[PDB]
Chain A
Amino acid sequence: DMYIERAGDITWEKDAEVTGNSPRLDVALDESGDFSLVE
């Protein structure tokens, strides 16, 4: 049986570490909820 444990508040953090890029990708979503790359 699965259980939940509190991990924190949901708040915006001022001056957080900014990382990650912003790619634009063509994707398809199948009936199983799996995303794949369209080529």
Chain B
Amino acid sequence: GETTDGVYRVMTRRLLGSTQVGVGVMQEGVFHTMWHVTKGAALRSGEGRLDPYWGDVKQDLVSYCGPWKLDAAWDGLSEVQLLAVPPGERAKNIQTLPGIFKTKDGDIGAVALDYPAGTSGSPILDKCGRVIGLYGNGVVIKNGSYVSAITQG
């Protein structure tokens, strides 16, 4: 199947028509997405099959064909870009200054951008084009807006 680096839509034909359930990143021969998008299921790419290789429900991440390859991190100061891939819509870069998720185990970057549920797995990038994490696991704050963690393996 298609193994060229890039951003991809995760689709299913089990529901009505073709529905986009999420997004992922192909890099160095490994496909990276969020666990809640595929639930660890195998994926089809053309005539080929991608099998899960590593996953963890608590991190909400899964990799296929090999181990997690994305190791860039937000520097805590600079603006980033959400390369949003919404259902039925073209990939679009949105620039933002991340906020912070303060946890008992440390801090995590957060992006306050609202997109449909099937945009989960869209990569967040630094100025150099490196994926610093995936968008799609976060919280709904006081006045119904969405804030996603910058989730990295």
Residues of B within 8 A of A37 (CB): 139, 141
Chain B interface size, as a band, is: 35 or more
Identify which of A9, A31, A32 gathers the most chain B CB atoms within 10 Å of its CB. Answer: A9
Question: Majority SS of interface residues in chain B?
Answer: strand
A10 pairs with B139, CB closer than 8 A = no
B9 pairs with A4, CB closer than 8 A = yes
A12 to B101, CA, bound (A): 24
Question: Majority SS of interface residues in chain A?
Answer: strand
Interface size on A, residues (CB 8 A): 33
Residues of B within 8 A of A3 (CB): 10-13, 43-45
A5 pairs with B81, CB closer than 8 A = no
A7 pairs with B8, CB closer than 8 A = yes
Write 12 A-B pairs (CB below 8 A) sorted by A numbering.
Answer: A2-B38, A2-B42, A5-B8, A6-B6, A7-B23, A8-B83, A9-B5, A12-B129, A25-B100, A25-B141, A28-B104, A31-B57
